[PDB]
Design a protein around this ligand. Sequence first.
Ligand SMILES: O=C(Nc1ccc(C(=O)NCc2c(C(=O)O)[nH]c3ccccc23)cc1)NC1CC1
Length: 164
Amino acid sequence: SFSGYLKLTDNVYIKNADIVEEAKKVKPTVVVNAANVYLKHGGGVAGALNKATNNAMQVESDDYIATNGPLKVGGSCVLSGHNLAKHCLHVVGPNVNKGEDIQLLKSAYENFNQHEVLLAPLLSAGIFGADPIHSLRVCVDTVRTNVYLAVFDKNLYDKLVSSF
Ligand SMILES: O=C(Nc1ccc(C(=O)NCc2c(C(=O)O)[nH]c3ccccc23)cc1)NC1CC1
């Protein structure tokens, strides 16, 4: 099971870890991907998860978009977790670097409530441009199911814990 996580609330836990390595070790029921609306997994968490699947995540994602069209910002879809998890919940948080509305971050975290337990990154953080301290606050105030947050950067992890 999940190990070495610091407890933040009744249901939110956090660890300084690479979500790829965490997923390979735990093989959770659900791993969250920090997706974009086109499911083009180029960089950040999405690029790293896709690379770990040997591009199988991108092949499945392209078939999903060809059938269904793009997701909405704040929306999600459930696909295979391949070699990382039973399922991957692809969630689209707003990308501040593309000018998207930061109020959609709460809608993005609401997708997590459809799953009892998840391994996840902070949405809209990293290359999506939002303040990770804000993202953690919205996560704690929105998600009611059990969420295990993996924060790649050690210095950001320490700041997130110390300012919580
Ligand atoms: O390449 C990797 N891992 C690996 C590579 C990159 C990341 C990463 O961009 N993280 C930042 C991030 C966070 C976060 O950390 O809060 N949230 C986000 C939301 C959207 C986009 C990005 C982020 C994460 C993991 N592993 C290989 C070597 C075995």
